[PDB]
Design a protein around this ligand. Structure first.
Ligand SMILES: O=c1[nH]cnc2c1ncn2[C@@H]1O[C@H](COP(=O)(O)O)[C@@H](O)[C@H]1O
Ligand SMILES: O=c1[nH]cnc2c1ncn2[C@@H]1O[C@H](COP(=O)(O)O)[C@@H](O)[C@H]1O
Ligand SMILES: O=c1[nH]cnc2c1ncn2[C@@H]1O[C@H](COP(=O)(O)O)[C@@H](O)[C@H]1O
Ligand SMILES: O=c1[nH]cnc2c1ncn2[C@@H]1O[C@H](COP(=O)(O)O)[C@@H](O)[C@H]1O
Lengths: 320, 317, 316, 317
């Protein structure tokens, strides 16, 4: 039963030249969509304060991915797509299982053919209703790569991949502004979740996202080390200029709101399993991305992985 | 050796409103119960008639504290005939306590539950008290505690108790563990005592140590039939404890029944805290029930009766 | 590797006021004891004459600190003849300490207990000192320490000590552990050493690390014959240490006997704290005994002698 | 997986009757001989100073001098302080510029007979080959090389020419390696493993980082470290570098990681900056560390530091 804080990665003998030699790009072929991916497999979360068009514009420059939140209008999308044609390939449109959610998703995907990824997102990915929903989206968009979640165990990973999802989002309760564990007692240690879900998905030639619980670049590296194909970040990317969330200047300091998508704040804006925080303002996100990628490059260097693809193979966890 | 904090519930494949009601048939009293098996503690700041009136609307249970007068009881009962079915009158082992109790149960036949409550449920003296109350009130359902191990749960049920209160030292204003070194991790206590009670077709209350709706779910998931709450229900309009406005903030006193504050009022194993004021308890009750419904949904339980069967605990650091 | 915080006592079925008195017969001095076997530590802020006067009224014991003149002792004895039966005169090693001790014992024959106390009870030098004291005072009961393991308990008892003082590094104002890395978890120390002592019909004092009555209970439950308290008795009226009123609050100094503060007063392995003022020690003694009585009640012990017998520890 | 906090040393019977903290070593590859008290001031720019070297020499301690002195500053120091040169190392990373600077120092100051080759990652084949090259170039100088945390790499570095292997990745007080990269190793375990590896080849190790009190230094020696290197414990003194800052009525000194942004700016981060309350003259700190370790030796029955690891039994806490 391992969380990120329970482990370190062992350094290992390497034959690398320097650490500039390290390639964080991955190449993936998705099981069901048959589509191909090339990029740095870190994803801005589809939270309304994180998965913003402003976030996507910066992250595109580092070949990072954005799961866009589900509170932009079609006109907002078409304006963005018009102005930022070269930002559309590492971008996903998001939906819950609502008929209204699905409608809106369908209009974006019709209006903006360059968007080739769908993020289907529920708190409880273990319901039959979500499984059937994944199957239907798969029937409606056979060439769109589907991310689906969330779950924390292998049986549910297999079933979602066999139902038509390409990439399974892994994490229940680990998120920085999540209160699922306190309100319900349900969840799963994230690193253990990733290890189990990674094996289960890879057995079927599918993929996973480690979604939530990362608070430093070291955690991101551990999740990749444990076999995650992608890592999704909320709190690390909140509080930047490009982030959503109200700017609040009080008592001589600057803060940004950050809140869970099932917080009372979110539910009012548009039973609670999320909370609100005020994050000290962080400035521009590009400095944060550079820190994250630098940290992972060094991890690779320490374990002798010349490419991120080699990281999980070269990873031996030490229990602390 | 587990506390609530040592575990998470594993989510499970479901095919599914969750029904949080339970139906019980009590081994010794032979009476039946239907309701939401969450109980307001018989603390003087929690088990109040004002608490009872709201909890009734949600079909929750109130163990009333032992510091109301007969006139006060008679008053409440005459104006609130429909709260009476999910109410227990409480007593310690005292002569005076038993007398107060008897007067209440005589004058208010609608009260069909008795909460017999001492800090140390392991004393022969307490065992003999339970027997005496079972003789006196053959048709009343008896809750009796507290204990933390199976052999004592067995002994108490065979002595006539229907429902055993489980917990020594986990409570939010309890100081037993610091004062005496005595106690038992609550989750382990519940698991063990639940197996013991259920072997005799009896029942248990997880009494103490819940500070969030997830804890309540873990107690139920571990096999508790009922969960008893003090701290989570303290601090509301309906709660007792003086309202204190200081430094532009509002607080409510909450204190252990063996605290120096309680003893003065009416050797210490309880403390006093000031709780920031919480407003109406109704909103807390919804938050709790909403939490537990979601637990049920996550593990594929259509009703609370299924939760323990569908619970697989995951050990967390 | 257990500390007090690592365990709880399991309650047990009972058929029961609890007697906190114990009777002991000492292996080497051949003397007998009846009393409540909680001891005030021989720290200059705790093992005071004022502390002894209160503790006597509850039949508790006082290991007097080693920084009173003989004239001070003579005056206390003259004025307080009934407070002398549960008192020890304390000493470190070396000529001057031995000489002081002798003078006190000679002047005040009612003092029948000797507390021999060094940081490291594992040295040959200490063993030989225990031997000398025993030979000089063959009817005095000897407390000697400190140690944490069974081989050393045995050697000290065979060298002539009656009661072995157990604990290295657990004290609230001790810094041995940070300074030297040396020590031993106190509860495991107690269990091990008690078995060693009791095999020779000797006795132990659990010395250090109790910060609440539950801790005292655990120490006895693990088989400690006596429990010695410093920090729990510091900060009272009867305690030494300067009363300091500052920022509208009252504090008392409390400090390790190897703190720079102590060394200066008369290589540090102790520290200084300021303890909020606690008032009269009487109320604290009652809270302590009240808590231990309730432990006995929870486990079915009618007498303190029955507590280790009826103790089952739960790892928490 | 052990850290210094996870253990205590068991006391033991002794017949001692002051403890000698001097050691003598004969180095595997350089064939040179050492005698002194084997505690080393780290080669951080705030710790490995000429002013530090001057005080530490009085106690027979060792200084790994930082990389940011000029050639004239070295030559001035050596001219004015001929008696300090026996117990210092000149330092270098693997960059062309570092190594050149070092060559110039060794050419100017023939009394400097120790070299400290110091990278964050001693596991690279690039570092291994650089060690071989420095050994070829300076066959009579004693070479300290690191950092690593496992035996295979200790052996390889020793076989490649290094005399003394610097052990520790991530434990340092102002290191952020573990947060930025997830990479590391518990320091006590690293020391035990690496000491065994080194000693089997007749080499030696330095436990580098993670000591915050004398007890930690004693534990590292007790685990088999030949030397212990200190950054944090020596920061914040008069003799230390770092700016003296008087603010809010108090005195502080900067202390920062050599891969911190502060250090990089000054001359992708894996170190941080702190302000350490000013400690005064380092001599009193040195007396406290030595007194602590002498006292550990006394408790375990070691007349001499050379006997400590042999008399050490760790108890897990
Ligand atoms: O209200 C919520 N409740 C529980 N989890 C949430 C909520 N909102 C967002 N999350 C999850 O937390 C993730 C971000 O985790 P973080 O990086 O630790 O902040 C998102 O990708 C979601 O999966
Ligand atoms: O004074 C006391 N000392 C120890 N436990 C107490 C005291 N008063 C009430 N309790 C217990 O604590 C429970 C409430 O626990 P809570 O929900 O954690 O606050 C009550 O139902 C009692 O079993
Ligand atoms: O300076 C010292 N260093 C280490 N231990 C000390 C020192 N002074 C007193 N002690 C011990 O601490 C014990 C009291 O511990 P306490 O009850 O935890 O405060 C005394 O009985 C001594 O054994
Ligand atoms: O920027 C840094 N990042 C990581 N480790 C560092 C850095 N700077 C110095 N160190 C290490 O930390 C050691 C000192 O550790 P300390 O004694 O715990 O302060 C040095 O000898 C280096 O090995």
């Amino acid at each position: 039963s391992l969380d990120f804080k329970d482990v370190l990665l062992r350094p290992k003998r390497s034959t690398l030249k320097s650490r500039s030699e390290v390639d964080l790009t991955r190449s993936f072929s998705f099981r069901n969509s048959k589509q191909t991916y090339s990029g740095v497999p870190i994803i801005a979360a589809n939270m309304d304060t994180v998965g913003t068009f402003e976030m996507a514009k910066v992250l595109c420059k580092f070949s990072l991915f954005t799961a866009v939140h589900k509170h932009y209008s079609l006109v907002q999308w078409q304006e963005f797509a018009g102005q930022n044609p070269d930002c559309l390939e590492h971008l996903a449109a998001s939906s819950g299982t609502g008929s209204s959610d699905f409608e809106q998703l369908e209009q974006i995907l019709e209006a903006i053919p360059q968007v080739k990824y769908i993020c289907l997102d529920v708190a409880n990915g273990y319901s039959e209703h979500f499984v059937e929903f994944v199957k239907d989206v798969r029937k409606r968009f056979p060439q769109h790569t589907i991310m689906a979640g969330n779950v924390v165990t292998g049986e549910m990973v297999e079933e979602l991949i066999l139902s038509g999802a390409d990439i399974i989002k892994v994490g229940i309760g680990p998120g920085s502004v999540c209160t699922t564990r306190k309100k319900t007692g349900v969840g799963y240690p994230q690193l253990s979740a990733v290890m189990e879900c990674a094996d289960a998905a890879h057995g079927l030639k599918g993929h996973i996202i480690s979604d939530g619980g990362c608070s430093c670049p070291g955690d991101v590296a551990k999740a990749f080390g444990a076999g995650a194909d992608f890592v999704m970040l909320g709190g690390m990317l909140a509080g930047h200029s490009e982030s959503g969330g109200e700017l609040i200047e009080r008592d001589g300091k600057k803060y940004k709101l950050f809140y869970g998508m099932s917080s009372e704040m979110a539910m009012k804006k548009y039973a609670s399993e999320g909370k609100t925080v005020e994050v000290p303002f962080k400035g521009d996100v590009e400095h944060t991305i550079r820190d994250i990628l630098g940290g992972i490059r060094s991890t690779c260097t320490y374990v002798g992985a010349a490419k991120l693809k080699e990281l999980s193979r070269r990873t031996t966890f030490i229990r602390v």
